[PDB]
Design a protein around this ligand. Structure first.
Ligand SMILES: OC[C@H]1O[C@H](O[C@H]2[C@H](O)[C@@H](O)[C@@H](O[C@H]3[C@H](O)[C@@H](O)[C@@H](O[C@H]4[C@H](O)[C@@H](O)[C@@H](O[C@H]5[C@H](O)[C@@H](O)[C@@H](O)O[C@@H]5CO)O[C@@H]4CO)O[C@@H]3CO)O[C@@H]2CO)[C@H](O)[C@@H](O)[C@@H]1O
Ligand SMILES: OC[C@H]1O[C@H](O[C@H]2[C@H](O)[C@@H](O)[C@@H](O)O[C@@H]2CO)[C@H](O)[C@@H](O)[C@@H]1O
Ligand SMILES: OC[C@H]1O[C@H](O[C@H]2[C@H](O)[C@@H](O)[C@@H](O)O[C@@H]2CO)[C@H](O)[C@@H](O)[C@@H]1O
Lengths: 1526, 67
């Protein structure tokens, strides 16, 4: 059905962690195949790789993976296959990886570097677990009960073994671990294997004899089998080692151990002549050690010639200096140090005159000097004649060269004998170790470090035997040349075994790899899995090759390994590459009760009430996605991985900690009788069995054997004594886990609470789906610590049921047999007296233990959380899609957003945002305010967060979500969304308090995802199919467009009105701004598809035309402020954008609006009948603006005086505009004016700036004339199509100019007036006074403004003209000017409003500055440095356009040979939007700020989300979409 | 020093990169589009047998004017 997982990748190709489960491995969940399907019928899993759009990896990117393309193809570690990444700047690419067989798989990415070179990422691994079934019943991996049995203690016959099989089958183990069933070596230790290719001749004879026994275990007792596999060593007496001695490290293969070989056999010879030479044989005196050690110093240490292995032979070098003194013909270099620096000269010879392998170990005299180059250094430093003091100089140099070697020798020798007299004590003197037998041939003073034998090639070899360094790094091969452990005697050896020298591959040991390969696949044909002892000491590439050979034979190979590497990270890497299925953990390692409770806490599960993952505001919501409309397209027989909700965003693949196999006692650790007591066997095994993982035990733990069995010596056989000790309890524990395994699946589905009080350990296992659970109280018996009483156990909102209780008591000592291993007689007494009190009011269960509860006892309770049934998850994960069926792009604003001021508008100031105690209020009142806070909480499972605390302290926030929508119930689809929230929040309140936070975030997250998907469906295709970043920008359109009560865009009704920004521009007269509305109209409404809403805003402002101008401050159409010369031209540009984009948009020109202001610019007759007087089509409204500007306008503002602007001066109210017809551009403004978007009016009385505008832009503004040129070009082509009827234009005198002549006037004079040429000679054509200048190659900011230096200022306003009127610019002039803005004026997120090199540059904005600074106080800085985000949009839109026309590297051929931008330009565009994508990701408000201080510094006064800040970035994506993505 | 397109002016000392597609079987062909008459030259940079950088002579060719 649906077995697909989504693995999202970062911009560098690394997998994204959806949750913080800790250091882990990308593991896929173990699930059975669909009903009646085998391996090959269909892919086991499909990993959907998600590559971000426009990421640097997409540039000629390829996905590599060693996954075979189909089931017929075998798996190869190093054969990777190609996959093409479909690059796009809008849409992410999804590439499927079909997996047909479990195993180890990795993937890496190759792409084109920014240096046009090839680059590769890391290899990223993911493991598909094997499928374990017995007959036809699936065995979940975390329900495995493993019984480890040793072969040589089960009887000499097969039926003697099948009696042991029946005993462990009665205890209901489902898996048996075998010590290797091969022919054992001399010492008969199970791990020193004589021959790997044939089994034990005592019991078996062929593969079919043992294969039938394992298959018999499967069919008879329903038990799977696995063995140990030994890679690191073999027995010291293998007949194939005589044929192939190179399989281990010898004097030929590993020459560095030659020094250690002679030390071993010199100590063994001293053991032969020990008291024969001296006196101490085997005494227990501290002096006896010292005297024998003094014999070692004089008979073996002092008998190897001072060890020339390090030191250069001094006199044998001088002897080899006179022999050929003359072939060496001096030197010519002058770098040789003089005899003054006696040490720098010593090492200078070491670097130039040395044979290969100097300093390292080899033969006896491996380190020697190149004679021919040494004498050449001597001759050029002293003399060419030898007798001239060369013997003294050459010896002085060589003696200094051996100074570090001699001190390297004293530090080595000290560790040789210090290690000796420390082990021989423990080896002989009873410190804690016995066997102080007089030094025998079998028990010499030195344990054999090397196995000596005469090979079939006649020669003699010395293969050593592996072991373990005390506290050394196991990742280092101590037999390799990098270690000096065999020399310094830092090795605890195993004489039973012998080295196995693998190299870099089969080329270094051909027969060893061929033999181990046939030995691995032999057991792979028979058994279900392997067990690897000391896997950390086996090299990676060695373990990788053979485990893949086994998986080719047995595709469902189950791998266990005792892995204790350097850290958890190294543990995960071994699990990643080797494909380890489970790690062995030992419960006997716990020294105390607190260490045991912490071990069980690690492998028990997740905390109770843990958060559940949900797709939130960090996912793409494609409008074309399949949906489970009622979470019903699932069948249990399909065994499909479930999506999170009704939306079919597949289950995410995230790193989870590697699976564990918790062993209460292995075959290497001491018995509970030894380390603790026998009574602890019951509570210890119960705590382990309760862990949510695989469990195991060694045979004898349940049968309470007295002491750990010696794997080497002991020959006694297991007892036939049935049902001894814990065998009855293990039957109960394994049978209980069989019931739980049927429904518990993923890591979020099993929760746990563990408590430790003195000698008691509490374990509470809980299933998160149904509420079923177990409660375990186990009193541990580490030692007889006396009587301790446990406090009252209290469970909230839970009912308890007594299951079983037992006590383990010792009845004396164990029998002493010599032919059978018998355990200690034990009584298993059932306990009673547990009082389970239940308060039918508080729904609280109390549990009181009985006083007869001795140490070594347990008691199990069946528990069930109240309010949770099996049908709870389905009710929460369904219905939300149907509930959002009637939502609109306006109504979603009330469900998701609404600022507190916006909410106060609907609630008259009564409601607002929920106040979280000890935290604050969410940013929005809707779900976005919750999701912005919950995303980090769910990621870290922060159950201690103030919101998490409040959610379980009461149901206030739960009811706050549902009661909010009463304000907006009458809106489209909000009532049905509220009812879904009401029904789901009501069911949640019936749950335990501690579970409310996890379920509250789940209900909110599901409805949020359904609301965000519904938005993408109602929007256009370019948005509804794009990256998270584009959709996040599109969601800002819903944040701004809302219906209000205190304001609107129409004076008669209350409809949807786009806010300027939240929360500072949302209520009353502060919401709508004509300049702000129509700059963001194309991005927030046209790019998104809000055509009808974009028409309403054009018509509403068309009603308030006056003086041929559109008002900036719109008071919903009653008494609007006409202090703007920018708005009228941004308004007429939005009309062009509407007609260009909207299909049939020409119909807007003939739409009649009710002109509610008289044509003769009258006063404010809002209530007069002359308001509704006359109508006006948009066609004549456009012409009314063009003709009124040309015919000249002259007026003082209506209602002039302080009642409007209480700081604007008297002369400031009389603004005005006219056109200089020698150039054709529009002037206007004064030094007391703010008619542009940089409208910051001073108000500081302490700084003497009241009424002085911070940025008056009087005269010709670049944006105004650029939009004027865009309007003229628009109406000219419109008249050509019969849609515009006007070409006449009146002048103040009476003259007429055709619209084309005015259009040509700008084309001939615009660039001439504004461009500042970089050529100092071309100043005579572009009208420039070079005295007041800053940088040339710049387009002006103003023409003939009040202060002439403000004309020649670098400001980002010229880019508005570059975007709307590109014909006014010669390409080479514009490209160089916009390149300066990129280097100088471009900030990280915002565009610098003023050149930093200017003297007026103050980039920090503080609207509360109470100082005497004439430029900074009370916010006069507003547009003199601070970085605005919307100007970045217009900047990059023209930066893309003019780099595409000028730079040849920004073009590439394509569809119909039409030039599309190269990946070099997309790369430059993508890099300039990373700070914008970071901003909207890590902001509580889901948008882009209005303003930013210098260099990304957050401005507190700036509105955190602005309409035109995000709308101008949506304009860029529409340019690249509407022009190339066809 | 051949300009990549007609928009780019000619500079004597501004040279542009071109990648040689190395093969042991197939020769590589690299086009030089010339839009305006003048003096143009080309030289080659490669990895020496000493793993160092080496450069050949500048080789010129003249595009005659159109009269
Ligand atoms: O209800 C009728 C209304 O009539 C009159 O309105 C006038 C205002 O009183 C008067 O101050 C002025 O408003 C201007 C403003 O002066 C001008 O600079 C510009 O807006 C700027 C602010 O200047 C600037 O400081 C900043 O203010 C933000 C602030 O940064 C933000 O952090 C947060 O605190 O919100 C503040 C705004 O509330 O930014 C804004 C936007 O860039 O334009 C304004 C409108 O023209 O002129 C008004 C003319 O009607 C009465 O005076 C007023 O009391 C009445 O309520
Ligand atoms: O004791 C007051 C109680 O209310 C607090 O804050 C919220 C409340 O939960 C909502 O119902 C809201 O409508 O009123 C307050 C905010 O205006 C705390 O949530 C709660 O813990 C506290 O005890
Ligand atoms: O009035 C302020 C002043 O700021 C800048 O002055 C520049 C000057 O023009 C340059 O020659 C520069 O080297 O020195 C000053 C900055 O350190 C503006 O260029 C100037 O127009 C403006 O008036």
């Amino acid at each position: 059905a649906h077995r697909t997982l989504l693995l999202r990748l970062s911009d560098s190709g690394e997998p994204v962690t959806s949750c913080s489960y800790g250091q882990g491995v990308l593991t896929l969940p173990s699930l059975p195949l669909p009903q009646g399907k085998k391996l090959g019928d269909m892919p086991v899993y499909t990993v959907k790789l998600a590559i971000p759009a426009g990421s640097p990896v997409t540039r000629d990117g390829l996905i590599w993976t060693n996954c075979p393309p189909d089931f017929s193809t075998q798996f190869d570690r190093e054969k990777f296959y190609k996959k093409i990444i479909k690059t796009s700047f809008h849409e992410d690419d999804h590439i499927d990886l079909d997996i047909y067989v479990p195993g180890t798989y990795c993937f890496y990415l190759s792409f084109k570097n920014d240096k046009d070179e090839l680059e590769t990422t890391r290899k990223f691994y993911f493991v598909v677990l094997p499928i374990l079934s017995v007959n036809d019943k699936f065995i979940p991996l975390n329900s495995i009960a493993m019984q480890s049995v040793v072969s040589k203690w089960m009887g000499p016959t097969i039926k003697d073994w099948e009696k042991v099989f029946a005993r462990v089958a009665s205890k209901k183990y489902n898996m048996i671990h075998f010590t290797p069933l091969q022919h054992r070596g001399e010492s008969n230790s199970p791990y020193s294997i004589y021959d790997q290719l044939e089994f034990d001749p005592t019991v078996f004879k062929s593969e079919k004899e043992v294969a039938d026994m394992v298959e018999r275990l499967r069919t008879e007792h329903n038990i799977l089998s696995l063995t140990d596999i030994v890679f690191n060593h073999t027995a010291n007496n293998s007949q194939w080692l005589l044929d192939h001695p190179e399989a281990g490290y010898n004097h030929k293969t590993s020459p560095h151990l030659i020094s250690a070989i002679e030390l071993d056999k010199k100590l063994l010879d001293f053991s032969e002549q020990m008291e024969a030479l001296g006196y101490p044989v085997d005494l227990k005196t501290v002096d006896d050690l010292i005297k024998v050690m003094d014999g070692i110093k004089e008979h073996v240490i002092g008998e190897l010639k001072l060890w020339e292995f390090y030191v250069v032979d001094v006199k044998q070098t001088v002897s080899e200096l006179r022999e050929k003194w003359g072939n060496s013909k001096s030197w010519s270099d002058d770098n040789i140090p003089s005899k003054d620096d006696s040490t720098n000269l010593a090492q200078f010879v070491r670097d130039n005159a040395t044979e290969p392998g100097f300093g390292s170990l080899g033969e006896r005299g491996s380190n020697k000097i190149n004679i021919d180059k040494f004498a050449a250094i001597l001759k050029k430093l002293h003399s060419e004649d030898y007798n001239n003091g060369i013997e003294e100089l050459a010896t002085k140099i060589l003696n200094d060269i051996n100074l570090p070697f001699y001190k390297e020798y004293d530090d080595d020798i000290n560790e040789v004998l210090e290690q000796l007299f420390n082990r021989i004590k423990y080896l002989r003197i009873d410190d804690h170790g016995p066997k102080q037998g007089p030094i025998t041939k079998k028990l010499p003073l030195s344990e054999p470090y090397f196995t000596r034998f005469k090979a079939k090639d006649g020669e003699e070899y010395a293969l050593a035997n592996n072991g373990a360094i005390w506290d050394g790094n196991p990742l280092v091969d101590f037999a390799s040349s990098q270690s000096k452990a065999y020399l310094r005697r830092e090795v605890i050896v195993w004489g039973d075994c012998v080295k196995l020298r693998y190299g870099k591959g089969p080329s270094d040991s051909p027969y060893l790899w061929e033999r181990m390969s046939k030995y691995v696949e032999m057991n792979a044909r028979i058994f279900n899995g392997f067990r690897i002892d000391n896997c950390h000491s086996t090299p990676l590439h060695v373990g990788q090759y053979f485990l893949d050979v086994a998986r080719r034979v047995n595709p469902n190979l189950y791998v266990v390994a005792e892995l204790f590497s350097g850290s958890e990270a190294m543990d995960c890497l071994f699990v990643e590459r080797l494909g380890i299925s489970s790690l062995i953990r030992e419960a006997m390692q716990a020294w105390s009760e607190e260490e045991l409770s912490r071990l069980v806490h690690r492998h028990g599960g997740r905390p109770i009430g843990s958060y559940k993952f949900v797709p939130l505001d960090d996912f793409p919501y494609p409008a074309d996605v399949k949906i489970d409309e009622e979470y019903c397209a699932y069948n249990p027989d399909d065994h499909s991985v479930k999506c999170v909700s009704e939306i079919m965003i597949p289950k995410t693949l995230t790193a989870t900690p590697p699976h564990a196999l918790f062993m209460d006692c292995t075959h290497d650790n001491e018995t509970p009788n030894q380390k603790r007591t026998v009574e602890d066997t019951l509570p210890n095994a119960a705590l382990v069995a309760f862990c949510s993982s695989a469990i195991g035990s060694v045979y004898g733990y349940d049968e309470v054997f007295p002491q750990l069995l010696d794997l080497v010596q002991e020959k006694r056989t297991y007892s036939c004594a049935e049902n001894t000790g814990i065998s009855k309890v293990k039957t109960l524990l394994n049978n209980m886990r069989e019931e739980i395994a049927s429904e518990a699946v993923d890591i979020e589905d099993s929760e746990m609470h563990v408590h430790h009080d003195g000698q008691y350990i509490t374990f509470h296992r809980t299933n998160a789906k149904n509420g079923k659970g177990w409660y375990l109280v186990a009193r541990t018996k580490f030692h007889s610590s006396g009587d301790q009483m446990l406090p009252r156990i209290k469970l909230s909102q839970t009912k308890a049921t007594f299951k079983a209780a037992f006590s383990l008591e010792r009845t004396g000592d164990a029998p002493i047999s010599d032919e059978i291993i018998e355990g200690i007689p034990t009584k298993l007494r059932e306990l009673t007296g547990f009082d389970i009190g239940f308060d039918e009011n508080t729904k609280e269960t109390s549990i009181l233990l009985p006083q007869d509860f001795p140490q070594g006892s347990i008691v199990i309770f069946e528990t069930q959380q109240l309010g949770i049934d099996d049908s709870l998850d389905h009710f929460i994960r369904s219905g939300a899609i149907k509930a959002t069926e009637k939502l609109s792009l306006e109504s979603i604003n009330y469900v998701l957003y609404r600022a507190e001021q916006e909410e106060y508008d609907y609630s008259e100031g009564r409601s607002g945002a929920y106040d979280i105690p000890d935290y604050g209020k969410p940013v929005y009142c809707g779900l976005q305010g919750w999701v912005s806070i919950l995303r980090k909480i769910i990621f870290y499972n922060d159950l201690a967060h103030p919101l998490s605390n409040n959610l379980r302290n009461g149901h206030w926030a739960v009811d706050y979500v549902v009661n909010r929508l009463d304000l907006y119930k009458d809106k489209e689809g909000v009532a049905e969304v509220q009812e879904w929230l009401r029904s789901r929040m009501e069911r949640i309140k019936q749950l335990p308090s501690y579970l409310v936070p996890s379920f509250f975030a789940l209900v909110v997250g599901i409805m949020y995802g359904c609301c965000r998907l519904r938005a993408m469906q109602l929007m256009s295709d370019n948005v509804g199919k794009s990256t998270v970043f584009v959709q996040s920008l599109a969601m800002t359109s819903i944040q701004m467009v809302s219906a209000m009560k205190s304001t609107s865009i129409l004076p008669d009704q209350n409809i949807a009105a786009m806010a300027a920004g939240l929360p500072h521009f949302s209520t009353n007269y502060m919401r709508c701004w004509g300049r702000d509305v129509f700059i963001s109209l194309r991005g927030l409404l046209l790019t998104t598809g809000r055509y009808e809403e974009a028409k309403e805003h054009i018509l509403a402002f068309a009603k308030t035309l006056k003086h041929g101008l559109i008002p900036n401050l719109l008071d919903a159409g009653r008494n609007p402020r006409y202090n703007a010369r920018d708005a009228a031209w941004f308004f007429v540009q939005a009309i062009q954008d509407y007609v260009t984009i909207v299909p049939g948009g020409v119909s807007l020109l003939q739409e009649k609006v009710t002109r509610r202001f008289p044509l003769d610019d009258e006063y404010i007759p809002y209530d007069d009948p002359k308001a509704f007087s006359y109508s006006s089509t948009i066609e004549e409204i456009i012409y009314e603006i063009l003709n009124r500007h040309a015919g000249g306008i002259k007026y003082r503002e209506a209602n002039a005086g302080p009642n409007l602007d209480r700081v604007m001066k008297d002369e400031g109210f009389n603004v005005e505009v006219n056109v200089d017809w020698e150039t054709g551009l529009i002037h206007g403004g004064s030094q007391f004016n703010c008619g542009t978007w940089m409208d910051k009016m001073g108000e500081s009385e302490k700084a003497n700036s009241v009424g002085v505008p911070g940025t008056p832009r009087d005269g010709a503004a670049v944006e105004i004339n650029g939009l004027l040129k865009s309007c003229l070009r628009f109406v000219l082509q419109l008249s050509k199509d019969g849609k515009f009827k006007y070409t006449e234009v009146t002048k103040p005198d009476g003259s007429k100019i055709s619209l084309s002549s005015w259009n040509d006037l700008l084309q001939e004079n615009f660039e001439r007036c504004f461009y500042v040429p970089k050529n100092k000679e071309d100043d005579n054509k572009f009208e420039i006074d070079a005295t007041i200048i800053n940088r040339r190659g710049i387009y002006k900011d103003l023409y003939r403004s009040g202060k002439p230096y403000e004309d020649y200022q670098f400001r980002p306003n010229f880019t508005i003209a570059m975007v709307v009127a590109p014909e006014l610019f010669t390409p080479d002039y514009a490209a160089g000017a916009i390149e300066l803005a990129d280097q100088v004026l471009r900030g990280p997120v915002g565009m610098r409003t003023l050149d930093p090199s200017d003297y007026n540059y103050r980039p920090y904005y503080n609207n509360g500055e109470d100082s005497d600074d004439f430029a900074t106080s009370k916010g006069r800085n507003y547009h003199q440095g601070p970085e605005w985000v919307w100007c970045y949009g217009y900047f990059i839109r023209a930066y893309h356009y003019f780099n595409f026309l000028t730079n040849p590297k920004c073009q590439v051929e394509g569809s119909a040979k039409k030039l599309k931008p190269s990946s070099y330009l997309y790369r430059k565009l993508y890099s300039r939007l990373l700070k914008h994508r970071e901003w909207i990701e890590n902001s509580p408000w889901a948008g882009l700020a209005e303003l930013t201080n210098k260099d990304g510094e957050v401005c507190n006064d700036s509105s955190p989300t602005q309409a035109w800040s995000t709308g101008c970035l949506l304009d860029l994506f529409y340019d690249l979409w509407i022009s190339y993505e066809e």
